Design a protein around this nucleic acid. Structure first.
Lengths: 487, 484, 489, 484
DNA sequence: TCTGTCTTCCAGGAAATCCAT
DNA sequence: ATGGATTTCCTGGAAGACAGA
DNA sequence: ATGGATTTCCTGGAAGACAGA
DNA sequence: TCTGTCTTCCAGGAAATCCAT
């Protein structure tokens, strides 16, 4: 760990402040005018903590896209409080003596010190609960900011305002839409041991869009503004904190495309960058990492995609028919390839498809998938090759490549004299499975004997069968049920 | 017709104005005093107006409507014409002895004028009788004498009033876009103001046992002129039919019933908005039959047997003769306020349940008279035990809101013939697979009661099997229905 | 085609008979191949089914629908099959000794069975009698025997015809008897046909089965039965040939014709392939009724273009007493036989069919030309004409069939211009007699007030072709022509 | 008159039979002289027979509409009287005896049974003759009467009816057969008549001998019977022949057939051998018959005039002469009447005449009886008649060029006057729109020749027209007539 | 015991046959 | 070359027979 | 001919606010 | 106190407008 080295380094500063106090006491100057040069060590530690803050912010960006998170944000508050503590004792020691230390340096010392105070508090202003990165108009949402140094400061609490800014407006350094209930006091919770402002009720009334772009790919953020003074008055500092970039939508149907933009950004945003610039193309392998993470995060599964899958995916998106997991790995993929370009005569983009299967699996197949009963991704070619060698009654489940959000059964026919020929059942949508679960639909069909390979259907899907009640309840009404057939 | 009598009497009136005009060649007269008979004609056209309003009220429920409102405007125009000629004839006279008779006459004349104009202000296009908040709707008024009264259009205003506020003679909920000019369309030969865009933002409800959804309101149209000879001021006001305003779809049903009750049984010219608490069950049957045929969209509706079953249900009566119920009365509380024994819903809620089900999914099957629709489990058991194996019928579920169920007969010979009742189908159930198709699926079902063979009956409702292949490269997967 | 499937399979059969003949060079389980060469039975089943199809086509032809008349290739199929049967039987017959005794017998059984069924199915009614048939009036009928050119030479058989009722036809006497009911089944080499034609036939008296439920006499169905026999060596199994006609309804006077027609129409339209004689459904999909009605209209009128969606809507309304206004409401509907011809229209004194056939005869007799010119709306409801014509100018008119009269057509026109409000007037309907006196075109010419045919066609332009020329010349001799024109007051 | 001659002469005979009874009772030459009164009886018999022949002749004349004393009741009475005195007288010879004057007594029985025989054989009459023009495969009737039937009981004798030809009838090869030709001669006491009526007679088919022509072959039905009345037996065979008839196969032969029959009935010689009739006749008698038949078939009380007969003579004789006295002593042949085409026409005189007969009977009886029709004229004489007349004068004449057509001639305009003849109207034309109505339509027709106004003349023949709107919604469409 | 269904009777139009023009 | 003559077939009008209620 | 993109209307599910029994 | 009444909130069909390089 990196964490302990820090406190030892802090121990040094506490010893340092003790020393200077003791000295300014006994005096009452050649050096210790020079001991004040140890506030450089303070400003050093501070910078470190600031970088540390940046690291968390990056971790937050990746939380969207579901990456493990040390979300707590509680100890950083302690680090900062400690720093402002020794700032306090330093400025105070400068306060006395009081003629036992050279006056010209008073300006330099107070200068660096109020400087580090300034920068620290302006950077201790964090968005802790980010607003939804994909955000629908006329729908209520929340966001919450946190001030780490609130617990050390009583003068009237400042009020944080939230305002819609565009990427253009955000670079700098007319409303573009008004936000209701965007006035909240930055309140101080002693039992929560936190200083925070939560906007439990936020609404976006109207929306204004700049002018290929697709609207959806238009990024904005909310600006949290505040100001508060510390007596002696005033030299008031204006606090502002920006959110992660968000896409504003008007209806559910835009959700898919929007998700992609945010996804992309979250993955590939620079740790330090201009709002809101991101790369044009990326390594295909890191894209594989992101796709796996989002898959596992949204489906709600502990185990996700495999190499063969990634291969099939590469094949799909690149239109490359290659067979080696090593050919594609050293390749770049652009955003336009990802979500802007139609693929292979189909009517939809790669992402639109992937998000399709994502929704299908989350909604109806999570159980089956975690049970590793679905191959999920393959070429029709590879099912023909894999299944022709298999006996009559062997089948497998694959995602439909032609329909968005569909899953289809492939099985082997026929036994004995006819040479085996493979059949593909038309895909099931989320609705089709809501009407009758995949497991049960599978149950109806007697003709498939084994799930590829060598696993018999009855053993595999025991847990997914819905029990048929039997009986006449009630009262008088014999249950009517639907089974599924092919011919 | 009474309409024709009107024409006869009016021809008499113009002949009469001819009489007085020629009599003015004096240059005694009780002729204009008996020509005070104009007031009679006025009363008659006013009655006819009352009748048209009643027809529109009954139009609220599905009914025939003579909507035209053109002949009425014509009648009115004719009458204010003879009034005009009358007044002008009275004006130009010596031998107005005594002058007091000039006074009494002028009084009578401008009085009938006033009452005529106050009665010519009609709601031609009524607002929706059950009305949801923050939703756009329309309404339009008509003034029959607008073509005679050029000055600037008045611009009628529409305001939400409550029943309490309506008896009389604030801000209960307000309406945006509630100001429209009363325009005079010469190509239409009509004076009318249509509110093409109206919306109600908020609603505040009067206050104990009765549910909100029976609270009646109306929109009030106000206007004024300010028509020559000046001043001649008279304010026009017209009330709409009573309406019930709702906040969400889930109240719709309960709302409809209130309006229905009101439209069917509102007395002519009642104080707003009184209606009887109980009515003859027969008239209720007429109303129910009408509403059923109207909402389903069918020319053939309920039968004696049906009405009997309904009477048994609503009265909790075990009687078996159709004549027992005929001289019976039925209350509003029975109609929509009393839960049905052992059930979770009121009678209206159930009836409208089947209304919605049939409208949505069964209109065709019903029109083909393949559904009994109404029948008790008992009578089906009795009817079906004597029938052979595989004989079935369709009946509405008594237990579920908006459900239809199959009752069939199976005889094993070894085991005595017994009735089986398939679980009822909801509208969703039928959207997933059609009734015809479902019936096709069940092989055991042989004959629709009585005699009719099932395929012959349901030929027209079977969906064709697509079979074949696609798309592309994909074999169709189909869902069929079974019982075990 | 099915034809190609047949010829390929037949080529296979002849190749197989080649194989078996050659296997006889052994002179085995190769006659187990003989047991699969019993696959001839498949081909038999196929040609029989095709016969069934031809019979069905004839049935629908009787209703004015397209027909493939020929029956020559079918006879060829039959000849081919009895040929391969013949060589097969001769092959089983020859080389008996090696042959297992049970197998030879079982085979012979299977084979002569397929022969028997083939010939019992080769006796067809080729020229049907009239489906609606009047007593003591001459009609004709003709049967054909497809295998007649093979068995004939022996003397030609009698081929007598007898009137049977539906009752008698189910089974499996003398309801009414017929003169000239015996003909020789002659063998015409120039025609390549064995056929027996009844050039002369007359039905003298009809005794009618007993009816209940008000079942009108005119819906009682009967047929004529053709019987014949040989007695053809290879003896000695004389097999009796019988063939039934299409069901027909026999009437006594013209006034029944109309009702008779419907009974036939329904049956022809909807008889379910093979059935016990003579059952047909009581109710059918309204769409199929529309198909049949369209077909019959075009057939009896004699026009290539018939009814439209809007017409069918009007008809659905009429027949169903329904006030619905959407063509989509009626589409998944059923219609019963009682509704079609047994239920009187509530306003009307007549049934739906009677009215419809009324317009059929009217258009046939006087209006085919006008209809083919698409100058007649033909089917409309006065309400819809009022709606359509009120917005139109003075002198705009249309032609619609009368709802109150059987076989009547009426003019609806729009008057009057300017101050008076527009009102629709309906001229009294014209009967066939009325039109014989003076043609529709001429009548329309006479009336000056109607200027435009709906929607915006000028009257003279549209009806130019139907105007009969007036004659300037006076004849004869010395006599000036007297002419009759039409007015309304 | 003759009735008296008979009854007084009969009183003589009865007085004498009383006389013989008294003298034979007084009891040889007496019987010889008293029997010579059977001489006055036999005289009387011949007399009554003549009266019968006269009636038979009148019946022949009954066709062509000549008044008829059809009754045949008094004649029966006369016959009954005669056989009554025959009976008692013959009986007197039998009873008075004892054997007196026997040798001659045999002779007595001879004369007596003779007069009885001739009497009964001549009392066998066809009372209801069959149609003289008779169609094959058609049901017809005929009835015979036996006048002495009430005096003769042994079973009624069979009466049979058979089709005979002229050749066969002379004497003294079925040639067409008759169904239902067997009827019993029944005796009606309440009707006081002995009769046999054949209500259901039909001629199945006919074979005709062979010059010219079809419709000229005359035939008859022969009624045969026998009794076989005591003293036995000397059975006497009764036969009666009908009037001559022409047998036709179709309606279109009717005209020609009629002529033949007409001729015969008019001109059949009394006592003539069947069935000879004259070849030519005086023209005046021909005019008489023509008038009789005209009034008879049209159904009118007043018929043809001198000028008409003149016009007819002119037509048939091809003569252009102008005096009614010229043609009067002329004779006309059968060939001229019906066997000869005239001039430019394709038809005979008779075919034309019966043509106008049918036209008038069918459509003009009313108009003709009202004397609004000239009926017969030449274009020549109408031109002479109308040129001098004012603008608007017209008349009606039968078409000479067409069979069964009537045409309007008028004098317009009216410029020198010039004459027009409208194309003739057939019976069909008049069925489509009545003559009266057609005349109404034409505005130019002002006066019926002469000095009579059209409106006054044809008021009653005008049909009232509505001229109303019904029904329902259907305005009547009417057909009028024009010429240019 | 009338209504309505069913039938038989009968007039006229179209047309086949033969003819002698 | 078509007119006449002589007959049969056959449609629809009209009215008679009859069964069902 | 047209398909896509972008927005609003409105229905019915679900759950939150709430008054009265 | 709490249940059932009443309301607000929000997802997703249709479907209107505009554009379409």
């Amino acid at each position: 760990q990196e964490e302990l080295k820090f406190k030892t380094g802090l121990r040094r500063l506490q010893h340092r402040v003790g020393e200077i106090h003791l000295l300014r006491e006994a005096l009452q100057e050649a050096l210790a005018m020079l001991l004040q040069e140890t506030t450089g060590e303070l400003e050093a530690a501070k910078a470190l903590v600031l970088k540390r803050i940046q690291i968390w912010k990056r971790q937050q960006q990746l939380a969207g896209n579901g990456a493990p998170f040390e979300e707590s944000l509680a100890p950083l508050q302690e680090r900062c409080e400690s720093l402002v503590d020794i700032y306090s004792q330093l400025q105070q020691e400068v306060g006395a003596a009081g003629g036992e230390l050279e006056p010209k340096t008073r300006a330099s010392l107070t200068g660096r010190l109020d400087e580090v105070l300034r920068t620290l508090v302006t950077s201790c202003f964090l968005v802790e609960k980010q607003p939804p990165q994909v955000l629908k108009t006329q729908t209520k949402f929340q966001a919450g900011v946190r001030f780490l140094l609130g617990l050390r400061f009583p003068a009237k609490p400042p009020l944080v305002r939230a305002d819609m800014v565009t990427e253009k407006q955000a670079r700098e350094l007319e409303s573009t839409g008004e936000i209701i209930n965007n006035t909240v006091p930055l309140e101080n919770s002693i039992p929560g041991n936190c200083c925070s402002a939560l906007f439990k009720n936020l609404l976006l009334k109207k929306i204004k869009r700049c002018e290929t772009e697709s609207v959806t790919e238009e990024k904005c953020a909310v600006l949290f503004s505040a100001s508060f003074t510390l007596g002696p008055g005033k030299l008031p500092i204006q606090l502002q904190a920006l959110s992660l970039p968000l896409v504003v939508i008007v209806h559910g149907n835009q959700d898919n495309n929007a998700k992609a933009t945010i996804l992309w950004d979250n993955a590939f945003s620079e740790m330090d960058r201009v709002p809101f610039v991101v790369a044009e193309r990326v390594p295909w392998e890191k894209m594989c990492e992101t796709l796996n993470l989002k898959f596992m995060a949204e489906v709600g599964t502990n185990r996700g995609l495999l190499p063969e899958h990634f291969l099939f995916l590469a094949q799909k998106i690149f239109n490359d028919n290659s067979l080696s997991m090593e050919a594609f790995q050293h390749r770049s993929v652009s955003w336009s390839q990802f979500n802007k370009e139609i693929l292979l005569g189909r009517g939809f983009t790669f992402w639109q498809w992937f998000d399709g299967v994502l929704d299908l699996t989350k909604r109806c197949l999570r159980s089956y998938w975690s049970d590793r009963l679905i191959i999920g991704f393959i070429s029709k070619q590879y099912v023909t090759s894999l299944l022709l060698n298999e006996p009559d009654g062997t089948f497998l489940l694959r995602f439909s490549d032609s329909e968005i959000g569909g899953i289809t059964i492939a099985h082997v026919i026929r036994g004995q004299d006819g040479s085996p020929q493979i059949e593909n059942i038309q895909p099931f949508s989320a609705k089709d499975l809501s009407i009758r679960s995949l497991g049960d639909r599978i149950r109806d069909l007697a003709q498939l004997k084994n799930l590829y390979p060598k696993k018999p259907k009855d053993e595999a899907f025991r847990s997914h069968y819905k029990p048929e009640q039997m009986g006449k309840d009630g009262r008088g009404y014999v249950p009517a049920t639907i089974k599924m057939t092919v011919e």
